[PDB]
């Protein structure tokens, strides 16, 4: 896995199929996490 | 993760030609490598591998008893040599590196050497 | 040793695509770990999909290396300009020997 992409040795990054038609629990959210004196 | 191919060159009919591939950025002897030829206005023709120690070969049928392929992983580059060339063998070839499952196709492409044969 | 494939395609932009490529003898499944290549003019064949169905990280996630009823096939969700190519298949077989299909030329409209 020497910088060569193939059979167990994969790009750690992986993109989400979103589209309008694709189900509930496929579709996109956004989402906040409001994280906790000023 | 580099293939730098060479040796392509307009030769005669009947004669023979070596071409040769480097590799750069990745360690050779760890990855099959490929051989793919294209005549132009054509799509792709298979026609060879080698495995990573050198142990086995292989080659489409169309070329089988013409062509040979030997390495040397201390240079880390392989050497295609094609005998009894035709004058209808005009095609760019191609390095690829195979890290697949079984080796037999590559995933990164060089970017070709030129044969014309007349 | 014999690969066939539709010769070509046209979509319209935003449009999915269906490429196939096929042996003509008994059926392709993952033991084939059929490839496809994209090439456009001047330049050298690239990979995009291997072993069936593993995209590369160059490849656009907008490709799928789907198979569909006994045939490998590399569809699109949604085809743009920049995918006028034209696209190859590669299957193995008895062993490291593989056999290129005719070419799929992918146009868009």
């Known amino acids: 896995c020497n910088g060569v992409e193939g059979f167990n040795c994969y790009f750690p990054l992986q993109s989400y199929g979103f589209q309008p038609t694709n189900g509930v629990g496929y579709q996109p959210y956004r989402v906040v996490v409001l994280s906790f004196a000023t | 993760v580099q293939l730098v191919e060479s040796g392509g060159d307009s030769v005669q009919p009947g004669g023979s030609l070596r071409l040769s591939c480097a590799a750069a950025g990745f360690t050779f002897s760890s990855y099959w490598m490929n051989w793919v030829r294209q005549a132009p206005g054509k799509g792709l023709e298979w026609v060879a591998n080698i495995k990573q120690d050198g142990s086995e070969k292989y080659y489409v049928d169309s070329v089988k008893g013409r062509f040979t392929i030997s390495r040397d992983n201390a240079k880390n580059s392989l050497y295609l040599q094609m005998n009894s060339l035709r004058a209808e063998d005009t095609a760019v070839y191609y390095c690829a590196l195979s890290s697949g499952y079984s080796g037999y196709a590559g995933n990164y492409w060089g970017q070709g050497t030129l044969v014309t044969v007349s | 040793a014999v690969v066939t494939q539709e010769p070509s395609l046209t979509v319209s932009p935003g449009g999915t695509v269906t490429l196939t490529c096929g042996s003509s003898t008994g059926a392709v499944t993952s033991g084939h770990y059929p490839y496809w290549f994209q090439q456009k003019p001047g330049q050298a064949p690239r990979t995009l999909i291997y072993?069936?169905?593993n995209k590369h990280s160059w490849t656009p996630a907008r490709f799928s290396g789907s198979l569909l009823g006994g045939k490998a096939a590399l569809t699109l969700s949604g085809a743009r300009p920049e995918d006028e190519a034209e696209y190859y298949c590669l299957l193995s077989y008895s062993g490291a020997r593989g056999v290129f299909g005719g070419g799929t030329k992918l146009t868009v409209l």
């Open positions: 072993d069936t169905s």
